[PDB]
Amino acid sequence: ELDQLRQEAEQLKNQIRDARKACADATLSQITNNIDPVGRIQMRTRRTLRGHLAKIYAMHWGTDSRLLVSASQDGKLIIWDSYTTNKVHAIPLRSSWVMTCAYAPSGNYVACGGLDNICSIYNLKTREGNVRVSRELAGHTGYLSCCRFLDDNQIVTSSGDTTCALWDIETGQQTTTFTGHTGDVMSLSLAPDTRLFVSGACDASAKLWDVREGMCRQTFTGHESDINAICFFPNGNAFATGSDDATCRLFDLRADQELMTYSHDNIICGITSVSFSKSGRLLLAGYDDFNCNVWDALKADRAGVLAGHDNRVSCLGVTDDGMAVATGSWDSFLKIWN
Amino acid sequence: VQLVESGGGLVQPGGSRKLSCSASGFAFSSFGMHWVRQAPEKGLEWVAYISSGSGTIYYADTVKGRFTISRDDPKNTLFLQMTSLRSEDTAMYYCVRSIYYYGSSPFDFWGQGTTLTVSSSDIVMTQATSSVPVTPGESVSISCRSSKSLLHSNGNTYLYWFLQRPGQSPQLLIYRMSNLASGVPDRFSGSGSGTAFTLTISRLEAEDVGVYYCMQHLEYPLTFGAGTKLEL
Amino acid sequence: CTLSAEDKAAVERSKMIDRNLREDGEKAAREVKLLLLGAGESGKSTIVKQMKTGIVETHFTFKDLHFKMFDVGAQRSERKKWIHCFEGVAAIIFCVALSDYDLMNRMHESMKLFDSICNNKWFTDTSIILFLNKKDLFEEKIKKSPLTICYQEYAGSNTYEEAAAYIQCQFEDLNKRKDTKEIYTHFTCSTDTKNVQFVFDAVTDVIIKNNLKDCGLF
Amino acid sequence: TVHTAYLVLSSLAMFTCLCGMAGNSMVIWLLGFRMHRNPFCIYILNLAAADLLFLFSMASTLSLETQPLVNTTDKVHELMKRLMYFAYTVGLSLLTAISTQRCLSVLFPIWFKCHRPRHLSAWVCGLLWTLCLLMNGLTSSFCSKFLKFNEDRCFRVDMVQAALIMGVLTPVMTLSSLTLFVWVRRSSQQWRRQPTRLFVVVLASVLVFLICSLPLSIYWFVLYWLSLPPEMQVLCFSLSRLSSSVSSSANPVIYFLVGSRRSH
Amino acid sequence: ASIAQARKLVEQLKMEANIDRIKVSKAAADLMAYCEAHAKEDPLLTPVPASENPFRE
Ligand SMILES: CCCCCCCCCCCCCCCC(=O)O
Ligand SMILES: CCCCCCCCCCCCCCCC(=O)O
Ligand SMILES: CCCCCCCCCCCCCCCC(=O)O
Incomplete structure (x- = not known):
């Protein structure tokens, strides 16, 4: 009956909790002790990108660490040359309500999506001189919150309809759907080997999915509010989540439980974006209090802040070679920091 | 187009x-x-x-x-x-x-x-080869020279290679030093450094026969080189 | 100027892109953005279909003023996540059906939505144009049955005018802060043409207020 | 004595000139290349620049007035006095333009929002600067002793200048502010809560203008067209200078600090 | 579909329960080893000289 199945689920959850607690020999901070801290590291803004005329919700670096795509509420997807602050491209979007944008690892495509519940793929390299929309992936019943290219023909998109999807761009059809995630999933992060991906939702939980199998592998909890940002450790065996709870957490895939928590009592604003540095030594989080915080990932303290924005920092990203970090904000300015 | x-x-x-x-x-x-x-x-x-x-x-x-x-x-x-x-x-x-x-x-x-x-300052591009005969299937390398270095401070070497078939307009092959164009076969390869540049064809077919020009884009005016003809 | 010939033509392209961005972002500042809200089957379609998938965007014009109204009632997801995207609209057109006072209660759901959205931190200053439509069916129902059959606190007379005034007063009693924003209440029906004029007048008031805020006088 | 009062007024004028120069420097800094999306900021930037020029010119005039005026001064001094005249006139014109723009922003809001030219403030400021420079050139090289020390012709030029200033800027500024006052009190205070801040700042701006900026112009007007004795002429000039200095120093506070929404 | 939802939840919990796990100490050691293995190639950890900084000028 329903009560019997509920009792079985409760017993399974208790067994899972006991198994997770059994293997927690020592805390992460215990091992990362008597180790040289990063120290107060100040990073200055080298470039300021001054084209957007509305709030910026998403930016993505190119794989060459030079091109940079950014989306704004003015219905603009601008591709910048970060070295010279030159605007390489400006794409007018059909729907100005865009909450995500992605850059193809090959560099030939960009993707965007938002409150239209569509994922638009635009081709950057055509025989004509204009950027053309290549595909319109539809099938999500909620707003699109994230999207990431697997290759030139595969893209995984998370929606507010509580499910993720993997698409075939050449046919515009969902090859697989990742369901079973109560509440809107607000972020996703592809593994460096592009074999798995994690997604954090409004149930205050993160889920690890196998792209090939199409089923959830592990579920991680510990937040008491909806998760807005998630990112993968460079190794690929861990990830970090930021939530409206005004805290960040580090989970380990193999240990299958929380490793440590990055928080401070002076911070009462949620995390909009999170990202790692090369070697995964610095966790770069964006907050609603108009500033970004650089935490030492191995420890739990603050390696620094950069601030520099007059409104909420919505998006941030780190280059593939770790040269700089770009931060966008609701004040309509992108800043490259080094 | x-x-x-x-x-x-x-x-x-x-x-x-x-x-x-x-x-x-x-x-x-x-x-x-x-x-x-x-x-x-x-x-x-x-x-x-x-x-x-x-x-x-x-x-x-x-x-x-x-x-x-x-x-x-x-x-x-x-x-x-x-x-x-x-x-x-x-x-x-x-x-x-x-x-x-x-x-x-x-x-x-x-x-x-x-x-x-x-009715009846400039950069010099020089190609000291012309009417070079070569059987198809071999590897042919042609060279170009410049008055001064085409390499710039940003790291770009502005040298372009063009192939003109007999009776046809020239077409781009390499749009910068070692930068293959779009739609051209992969056998063509540009290389060079400073003032000396080279274009190599690993296995020339019967179609890539014509006049090969090197052009500079470092500064205006854009100066071509004298053609290096290839004969079957 | 320490630039190559290709770099100079790249900067010119960027300058042209900037010029086009300014031109596109200057005609956007001359348009009026309205956020359309309301419960299901609450006459929202009637007021959005006066003249001329996630967000449904409707663009119309009235006396040299361009209005963009974004109906977002088909989201069916967590409103707290995508509601900050509309921080900056001129007004919130909130549609409520008067006849849905006894159909768990539809009117209670409408008041819950109004309380949730009016006191939102993102819409603390934006004005609300409250449309109370299907008033003909409300009159017919009141003639058939008084409001007191479902409502208990209604100690007033079972008259159509008194019941409508009671509903309106209860609805504008739901905003905690009456100084930051002004609620415009309008009684409409299926056959009406004054809705566009009323929203235009409310937008004119908010435009004057925005200008005063720009001066710093307000 | 009267000389003691003159010295006290000169020292006070120096102090308020320093304070106004500092304040206008800050207003120039924060608003310099930012806040320009606001249609009301170009006028405020131009007014801050004009007030800074006026205060610098009068501060240096008072600084050099202590030294004897025989050959080293009295030539740069006259040019700099005319420069302060020019800055005063352009500041008054900019105040009039600011008041007119504020009145138009609420009298015709649809036109101000979706039909006002974007560069209207910029070239209106340019026209004001050009006209003030032209008029003060027609005043300096024509009435000052440096080039043409005329008496009747200088009198006519100064009368034309003062008539223009008073009977053009004063009616336009006062009527625009009164129209804004009446319109806000009638079409806005009846329904919502009274905008007391608007009323108080509009009244303060009008009072500051009329009581402080105008005395220098009326002193110009009454220097000629009458037979005033020279006994209290110095006192009247010092009072007018102090009033204009107070107006110039208080303009940034009531036009930028009060008018601050994008600077937060 | 309460029965179907409960069965799906039970099966998912069973699948997650049988996951092989490793001690947290070893995972933390692996994370530390990765951090110290790639510390040299971390421009944000140690600011690069202006010559090798593409965003410096
Ligand atoms: C030759 C006489 C010049 C007229 C003097 C008045 C100048 C100020 C008033 C007109 C300019 C400002 C009015 C429009 C301002 C605006 O709407 O932006
Ligand atoms: C010398 C500077 C010129 C600027 C002052 C001119 C302002 C003209 C205003 C015309 C408005 C006519 C239509 C108004 C309609 C409305 O209420 O928006
Ligand atoms: C001789 C006096 C020189 C006149 C100076 C003209 C000043 C015009 C205004 C300058 C700043 C204008 C701001 C840029 C224009 C704009 O933002 O639309």
């Missing part, structure tokens, strides 16, 4: 004629446009350039003052008006589209060209 150049014909000395190019199949207003010249027996020679949006305009020294270049983006047409046509202006004129942003391929498409017959 197509560029059809119209005008030309027989012109008396000291006269005037208007050359047009009707571009179609691409976003004309986003492309800078060049007029390039080729004498009936000599190589290619750059003539004029107009940027996107009719901004900066450049002319060759040998035609500065008596030539003018304009464009009509709503009509998608490029005009070259010439006055006081001397006897040295009898040649075939090609129209070349050229877009300029990071990672673009300038001079990617060349027009068919039109013939104009009239």
